[PDB]
Scaffold this active site. Structure first.
Site, PDB file in Angstrom:
ATOM      1  N   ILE A  15       4.623 -98.132  34.814  1.00 47.41           N
ATOM      2  CA  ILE A  15       3.297 -97.533  34.733  1.00 47.41           C
ATOM      3  C   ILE A  15       2.213 -98.567  34.981  1.00 47.41           C
ATOM      4  CG2 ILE A  15       3.963 -95.557  33.281  1.00 47.41           C
ATOM      5  CD1 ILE A  15       3.080 -97.153  30.747  1.00 47.41           C
ATOM      6  N   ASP A 129     -12.284-108.625  26.478  1.00 46.44           N
ATOM      7  CA  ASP A 129     -12.009-108.040  27.797  1.00 46.44           C
ATOM      8  C   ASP A 129     -12.112-106.519  27.759  1.00 46.44           C
ATOM      9  OD1 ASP A 129      -9.375-108.371  30.308  1.00 46.44           O
ATOM     10  OD2 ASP A 129     -11.580-108.496  30.518  1.00 46.44           O
TER      11      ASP A 129
HETATM   12  C1  LIG Z   1       2.736-102.496  26.066  1.00 45.58           C
HETATM   13  O1  LIG Z   1       1.618-101.938  26.853  1.00 45.58           O
HETATM   14  C2  LIG Z   1       0.568-102.794  27.142  1.00 45.58           C
HETATM   15  C3  LIG Z   1       0.634-104.116  26.649  1.00 45.58           C
HETATM   16  C4  LIG Z   1      -0.433-105.021  26.890  1.00 45.58           C
HETATM   17  C5  LIG Z   1      -1.512-104.607  27.681  1.00 45.58           C
HETATM   18  C6  LIG Z   1      -1.575-103.259  28.166  1.00 45.58           C
HETATM   19  C7  LIG Z   1      -0.518-102.379  27.894  1.00 45.58           C
HETATM   20  C8  LIG Z   1      -0.473-100.930  28.331  1.00 45.58           C
HETATM   21  C9  LIG Z   1      -0.593-100.510  29.661  1.00 45.58           C
HETATM   22  C10 LIG Z   1      -0.576 -99.170  30.101  1.00 45.58           C
HETATM   23  C11 LIG Z   1      -0.450 -98.099  29.254  1.00 45.58           C
HETATM   24  C12 LIG Z   1      -0.294 -98.457  27.811  1.00 45.58           C
HETATM   25  C13 LIG Z   1      -0.346 -99.853  27.329  1.00 45.58           C
HETATM   26  C14 LIG Z   1      -0.247 -99.669  25.852  1.00 45.58           C
HETATM   27  O2  LIG Z   1      -0.241-100.669  25.067  1.00 45.58           O
HETATM   28  N1  LIG Z   1      -0.104 -98.379  25.443  1.00 45.58           N
HETATM   29  C15 LIG Z   1      -0.185 -97.638  26.594  1.00 45.58           C
HETATM   30  O3  LIG Z   1      -0.023 -96.380  26.585  1.00 45.58           O
HETATM   31  C16 LIG Z   1      -0.407 -96.930  30.008  1.00 45.58           C
HETATM   32  C17 LIG Z   1      -0.323 -95.606  29.642  1.00 45.58           C
HETATM   33  C18 LIG Z   1      -0.344 -94.661  30.654  1.00 45.58           C
HETATM   34  O4  LIG Z   1      -0.239 -93.383  30.287  1.00 45.58           O
HETATM   35  C19 LIG Z   1      -0.494 -94.987  32.017  1.00 45.58           C
HETATM   36  C20 LIG Z   1      -0.605 -96.372  32.462  1.00 45.58           C
HETATM   37  C21 LIG Z   1      -0.578 -97.366  31.394  1.00 45.58           C
HETATM   38  N2  LIG Z   1      -0.625 -98.767  31.377  1.00 45.58           N
HETATM   39  C22 LIG Z   1      -0.825 -99.711  32.473  1.00 45.58           C
HETATM   40  C23 LIG Z   1      -2.244 -99.404  32.982  1.00 45.58           C
HETATM   41  C24 LIG Z   1      -3.190-100.593  32.750  1.00 45.58           C
HETATM   42  O5  LIG Z   1      -4.549-100.284  33.217  1.00 45.58           O
END
Ligand SMILES: COc1ccccc1-c1cc2c(c3c1C(=O)NC3=O)c1cc(O)ccc1n2CCCO
Length: 252
Positions: A15, A129
């Site tokens: 994702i 950020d």
């Molecule tokens: C361990 O995850 C992360 C660790 C550290 C930084 C960011 C994330 C991240 C990215 C993330 C999503 C989700 C998370 C999150 O912590 N919880 C989410 O749900 C998510 C949910 C989604 O429905 C679509 C795309 C998507 N991304 C990447 C998009 C970045 O713009």
């Protein structure tokens, strides 16, 4: 092999680029798991993300953390999955169809993110950020995520966030009012949701906003709301409201 990762989770899709949507075999729930190359100063930075999440787990407007571990040449963090994607994806879709967040929706966004930020700040941390790609959607519920730049409020050293959202004093390395850097990026975040053009990375339009001028918004907002956003980007950080003052604002 047999990762903890492989054995405890079934991976559904990538994702983000890495972050995967994963079902945990035992509990049946979906999580987002980031797998990054394990790093040293670069390791201190990676561990602050973990220490930040482990103290920021009790709030509705901050993405919840479940676990973190290391295996291989990899570090992993398992967070709440937010099925509405990021605010950057919502905003990009809205741009395409020419239908934006309406004033009531912008106030909801500003107030929800405002409350995540109030909590972050009452733990003597700053996010550093704030931007649409770090706000996740789940009533719509908006949750601050991506804690990779979090630091303590009185930190003498700072890693600066995205330049489109970055307040000038942080760029001049004046870290005396770090919390007001988060207030500044949140105003510009709400300006994007309202329908403005992509923010500049540098050049003369970057400096104009930093003089305290709002980018153009292709919709009509109450003078009051617009006044609140303008004061959130005032060149003098002491003039910007705290997150406390923000969530108790009359306009909200
Ligand atoms: C361990 O995850 C992360 C660790 C550290 C930084 C960011 C994330 C991240 C990215 C993330 C999503 C989700 C998370 C999150 O912590 N919880 C989410 O749900 C998510 C949910 C989604 O429905 C679509 C795309 C998507 N991304 C990447 C998009 C970045 O713009």
């Amino acid at each position: 092999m047999k990762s903890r990762y492989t054995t405890e989770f079934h991976e559904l899709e990538k994702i983000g680029s890495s972050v995967f949507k994963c079902v945990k075999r035992l509990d049946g729930c979906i999580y987002a798991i980031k797998r990054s190359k394990k790093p040293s100063v670069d390791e201190q930075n990676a561990l602050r993300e973990v220490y930040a999440h482990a103290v920021l787990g009790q709030h509705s407007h901050v993405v919840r953390y479940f676990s973190a571990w290391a295996e291989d040449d990899h570090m992993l963090i398992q967070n709440e999955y937010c099925n509405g994607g990021s605010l950057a994806d919502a905003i990009s879709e809205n741009y395409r169809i020419m239908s934006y967040f309406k004033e009531a929706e912008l106030k909801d966004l500003l107030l929800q993110v405002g409350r995540g930020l109030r909590y972050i700040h009452s733990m003597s941390l700053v996010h550093m950020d704030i931007k649409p790609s770090n706000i996740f959607i789940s009533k719509v519920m908006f949750k601050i995520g991506d804690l990779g730049h979090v630091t303590r409020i009185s930190s003498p050293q700072v890693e600066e966030g995205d330049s489109r959202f970055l307040a000038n004093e942080v760029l001049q390395e004046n870290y005396t009012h770090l919390p007001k850097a988060d207030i500044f990026a949140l105003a510009l975040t709400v300006v994007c949701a309202a329908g403005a053009e992509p923010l500049p990375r540098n050049g003369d339009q970057w400096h104009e906003i930093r003089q305290g001028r709002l980018p153009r918004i292709p919709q009509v907002l109450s003078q009051e709301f617009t006044e609140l956003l303008k004061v959130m980007i005032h060149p003098d950080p002491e003039r910007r409201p705290s997150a406390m003052a923000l969530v108790k604002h009359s306009v909200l």
